[PDB]
């Protein structure tokens, strides 16, 4: 226990959560993002709002949180409050009336390599273009758009953990069957700024 206390003290003595966790500011923070769908809570056809319970797994390397395991008795991983570290500010762009960003700040898992894994729970009320023509035999292609709100792709780069959302924990809905799911990474360039 004393080893882990010493480690946590040594790491955060002069840590800063404002700067990006890179050796040089010209580097890009590589964040790996993976959506896990736990439950399809509701589909609101009149308001076009879909309520879902998800885990938004995020992984990145913090260059400053490395340590040598033999200095601390072989401690290879520790859990620390996510409020202390730098975090990607992923926002649900197409939020209807829910929380835009993560608000349940669970603890992250920090490994001696500086690899951080964060899997905060969130309830996403994504806006969906409900098509009602074939009601009640309709198929709804509802989507969730996740991106860093303020960081751009030349500063922080997000990559999908897998081509499809993780449904291994999905609770079966009594009203809807998920026929297909897929994740796509989109990059867009604007006439202001080629780079």
């Amino acid at each position: 226990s004393e080893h882990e206390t010493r480690l946590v003290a040594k790491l955060f003595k002069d840590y800063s959560s404002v700067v990006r966790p890179v050796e040089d500011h010209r580097q890009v923070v590589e964040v790996t993002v993976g959506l896990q769908l736990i439950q399809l809570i509701n589909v609101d056809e009149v308001n076009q709002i879909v309520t879902t319970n998800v885990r938004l797994k995020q992984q990145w390397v913090d260059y400053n949180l490395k340590w040598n395991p033999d200095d601390y008795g072989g401690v290879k991983k520790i859990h620390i409050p996510s409020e202390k570290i730098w975090r990607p500010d992923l926002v649900l762009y197409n939020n209807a009336d829910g929380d835009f960003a993560i608000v349940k700040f669970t603890k992250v898992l920090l490994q001696y390599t500086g690899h951080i894994t964060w899997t905060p729970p969130a309830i996403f009320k994504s806006y969906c273009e409900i098509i009602v023509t074939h009601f009640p035999f309709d198929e709804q292609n509802c989507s969730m758009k996740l991106g860093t709100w303020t960081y751009d792709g030349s500063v922080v780069a997000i990559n999908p953990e897998s081509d499809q959302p993780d449904l291994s924990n999905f609770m079966e809905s009594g009203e809807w069957v998920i026929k297909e799911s897929r994740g796509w990474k989109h990059s867009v360039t604007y006439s202001c700024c080629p780079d």
Partner: antibody
Amino acid sequence: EVQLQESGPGLVQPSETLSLTCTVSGFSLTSYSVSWLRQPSGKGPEWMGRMWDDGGTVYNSGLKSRLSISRDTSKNQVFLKMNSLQTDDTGTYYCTRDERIRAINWFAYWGQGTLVTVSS
Amino acid sequence: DIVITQSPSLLSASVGDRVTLTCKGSQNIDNYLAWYQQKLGEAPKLLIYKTNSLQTGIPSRFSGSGSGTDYTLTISSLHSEDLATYYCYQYINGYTFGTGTKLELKR
């Protein structure tokens, strides 16, 4: 300015406790960690343990049971005790001052080193 | 722990020659490799750390380079004072030291 002097019994019989002292000059033990290195004859050095600035200690996992380290901040000395010596423990012993960057540590200054020989 | 090997074991060189020393790990050392100089009966002296950074008061003759698994120490102009044994060591995953290379005068 910064100097470390290693001293102690150069000839030690097997099965009796080795003791070594490191004398520090030019810096305070409350601001710099001190670590002990061992170099068996005919081999590259190895790391044995560290006296932390906060007053705690850490040891090589193979030597964890054998080694004991302590310090006296009032006289700038670091002490090492080691029992159950064998002929394989013959070598040169260095105390070092350690730099830090965040949680990472490395050795920046060495003592002159004391030779310890174990023979019947 | 990461195993480290050095080559050559002995290097014969003459004053003023460009001389370079190779240190090679068994795993990614991530630029956390350091070089120190040792002389017979003298206290070893740190030359380079983080693969690139001179220790204060070391002559600018010494410069290090490398990334990933392979690292080098280079002396721009060998002086007679530089004949010594050079050890590389890494400090991200345990502490492991190379076998050392002995730098000796060509004759």
